[PDB]
């Protein structure tokens, strides 16, 4: 006859929210079918669904969302899927890889690859993605899957755990008319099985209005009408209004609240033929998953596959460093030991630390461009904050921060002719690696939690300029006054320029035919590399060389702890 006997209802009685008050008296039940929450954008159309699930703060509402006469159970995260309005699924991965990534984190670890492969192929067969799963999704740069199946594959990541009460946030925004009915036929097909498809459409059509089972109208937190969708036009026809011939039924309800206002329609539905039945049923009915290794493996795997398939930012960063080091070694080719050798040595050493410190602005776009995905998967039951922070860090700050540092010193070293030593080559390589790591770690301590990329970049270029002045070349570090010399310890390029300067100006002379390593007659000459280090404020002991390394290592852990605390205390609602 049919296909199901009962469904998981979701009843609510007196829903009041305040942030100040955004919802007043909202009540009604949601029978298992395909119900919709209509209304304008200024009301609680897109805000009722956030309180219907677990998307808002518990200290803001005062009602109660009962599920079959019982409150929200503990398996609700695994029995309800929320579909985000904007894009969520990555474009650098295919449909099978996107479904397998969420299937490996949402399902339990007791399931092998046999049940997970047939579960993914089952969702693919119901989603109609047999020929799409074998292709990449695509983004603004590569083409693969158009927008007709982007919303289909976005909901496929939620049907992995076989939910009962599926939630959607405007599933028709960003589509046309053919794809709206294509995506709605699948929702009606899944609704006929036994799912409670609740969403909030925005200005639909008659071909989509006829498919709704229930309908709730909201306008500025006031319940205007709640009942079947077929009886919505008949209720307003005897209340004082009447729709015209050849008119959209959904547009007539939105035209009534606008002026064919909000104080007379709220006092109409409270004493009608649809409020006493709902109040009679409402008072009757009302009176992590995986381990840390599996999360750190699948998160770093998806981030590494995303970084490998993005040639516009990974390979371009290597070409911009290869052509930079080639033109640097070509200009400084021939570092002689004369009067001009000190200016060439200090300029080539200062430019390497300034370029490594100013190239960390590109690393800011790491947590800000994927903020909606982190706040969506974290409150859904995917991983924790430490697993996401370590998975994105092990896949982005390691192969893109250490690669331009090693290729930048293996070319200009044998090309310039700094110090022909085996240990000196590895010292400046490790110094540039610690400089780029500390600058990117400082970049992550500012952009964590924010969304606007213009403020994190304006504040970073401002503090990078202030740290660039205190490096040791534009101004001497010993002539600064006492109430300002303490600011030299709060920089980044200074530790790199100090360790880079100590590694070269050592047993090198700078005056031809004037041995001044034991006797320097006529002062004010600087005829050795040691006189330049003391003239700038550098210690000649070997401890002074490793002091900047132990200072940059401490600044790395401090900035990473601040970035982790900023991601832990973030508002996930």
């Amino acid at each position, epitope marked *: *006859l049919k*296909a199901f*006997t009962e469904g998981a209802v979701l009843s609510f009685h007196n829903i009041c929210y305040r942030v100040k008050e955004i919802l007043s008296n909202i009540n009604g039940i949601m029978k*298992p079918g395909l119900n919709a929450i209509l209304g304008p954008t200024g009301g609680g159309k897109s805000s009722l669904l956030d309180v219907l699930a677990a998307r808002k703060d518990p200290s803001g509402l005062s009602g109660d969302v009962l599920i079959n006469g019982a409150p929200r159970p503990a398996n609700f995260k695994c029995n309800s899927g929320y579909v985000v309005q904007d894009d969520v699924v990555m474009g650098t991965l295919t449909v099978r890889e996107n479904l397998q990534f969420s299937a490996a984190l949402r399902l339990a670890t*007791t399931m092998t690859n046999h*049940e997970k492969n047939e579960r993914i192929n089952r969702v693919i067969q119901e989603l109609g993605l047999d020929k799409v799963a074998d292709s990449k999704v695509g983004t603004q740069f590569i083409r693969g899957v158009s927008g007709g199946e982007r919303k289909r594959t976005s909901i496929g990541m939620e049907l992995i755990t*076989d939910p*009962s009460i599926l939630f959607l946030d405007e599933p028709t925004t960003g589509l046309d008319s053919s794809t709206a009915n294509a995506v709605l036929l699948l929702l009606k097909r899944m609704s*006929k099985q*036994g799912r409670t498809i609740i969403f909030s459409i925005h200005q639909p059509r008659y071909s989509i209005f006829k498919l709704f089972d229930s309908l709730t109208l909201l306008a500025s937190g006031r319940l205007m009408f709640h009942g079947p969708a077929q009886e919505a036009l008949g209720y307003f026809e005897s209340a004082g209004y009447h729709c015209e011939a050849y008119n959209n039924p959904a547009d007539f309800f939105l035209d009534i609240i606008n002026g064919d206002l909000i104080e007379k329609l709220a006092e109409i539905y409270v004493n009608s033929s649809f409020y006493k039945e709902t109040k009679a049923e409402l008072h009757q009915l009302s009176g992590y998953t995986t381990s840390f290794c599996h999360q750190l493996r699948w998160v770093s795997k998806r981030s590494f596959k995303n970084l490998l398939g993005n040639p516009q930012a990974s390979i371009a960063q290597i070409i911009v460093t290869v052509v930079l080091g080639l033109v640097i070694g070509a200009i400084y080719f021939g570092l002689k030991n004369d009067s001009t050798g000190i200016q060439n040595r200090a300029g080539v050493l200062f430019f390497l630390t300034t370029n490594q410190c100013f190239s960390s602005v590109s690393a800011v776009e790491l947590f800000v461009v994927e903020k909606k995905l982190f706040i969506h998967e974290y409150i859904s039951g995917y991983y924790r904050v430490s697993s996401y922070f370590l998975g994105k860090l092990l896949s982005d700050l390691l192969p893109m921060r250490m690669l331009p540092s090693i290729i930048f010193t293996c070319i200009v070293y044998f090309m310039l002719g700094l110090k022909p030593k085996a240990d000196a080559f590895f010292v400046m390589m490790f110094t540039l690696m610690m400089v780029a790591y500390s600058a990117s770690s400082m970049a992550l301590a500012i952009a964590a939690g924010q969304s606007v990329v213009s403020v994190a970049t304006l504040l970073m270029t401002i503090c990078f300029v202030f740290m660039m002045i205190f490096s040791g070349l534009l101004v001497n570090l010993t002539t600064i006054a006492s109430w300002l010399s303490w600011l030299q310890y709060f920089s980044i390029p200074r530790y790199g320029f100090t360790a880079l300067q100590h590694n070269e100006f050592l047993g090198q002379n700078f005056c031809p035919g004037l041995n001044a390593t034991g006797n320097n007659p006529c002062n004010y000459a600087t005829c050795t590399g040691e006189e330049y280090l003391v003239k700038q404020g550098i210690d000649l002991s070997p401890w002074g060389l490793w002091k900047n390394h132990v200072a940059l290592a401490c600044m790395i852990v401090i900035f990473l702890t601040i970035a982790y605390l900023k991601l832990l205390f973030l508002k996930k609602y």
Partner: nanobody, 122 residues
Framework: QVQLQESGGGLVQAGGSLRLSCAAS????????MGWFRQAPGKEREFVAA????????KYVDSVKGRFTISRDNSKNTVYLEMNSLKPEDTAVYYC??????????????????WGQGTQVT
């Protein structure tokens, strides 16, 4: 990769009540939709009921009403299909099914994946 084992015996005709416990394996019992079937001596496969995982949207026979009570417990991996005042028109071996992804089951030939032997219920 799971199996179905039976335990509820059946030999009483037109009795009061009879509960059949069809336990399974211990890998992923809370990730399947356990159900039952009916094989009459002379008929093919007849669907009876199928409870979804998590104790939600279930399904019964379009003929019989709420006399059937099927409940699957996630603990011990056991599902029951008990009746209330069964009719004599029940002489049939009862099968045990285990399917993944609840597709609806409109009381027809569903043919679940992991099957079972099924015990005769007279």
């Amino acid at each position: 990769q799971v199996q179905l084992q039976e335990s509820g015996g059946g030999l009483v005709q037109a009795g009061g009540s009879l509960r059949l416990s069809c336990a399974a394996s211990g890998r992923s019992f809370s990730s399947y939709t356990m159900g039952w079937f009916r094989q009459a001596p002379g008929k093919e496969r007849e669907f009876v009921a199928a409870i979804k995982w998590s104790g939600d949207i279930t399904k019964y026979v379009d003929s019989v009403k709420g006399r059937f009570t099927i409940s699957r417990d996630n603990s011990k991996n056991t599902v029951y299909l008990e009746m209330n005042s069964l009719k004599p028109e029940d002489t049939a071996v009862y099968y045990c099914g285990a399917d993944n992804t609840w597709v609806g089951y409109p009381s027809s030939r569903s043919s679940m994946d992991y099957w079972g032997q099924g015990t005769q219920v007279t």
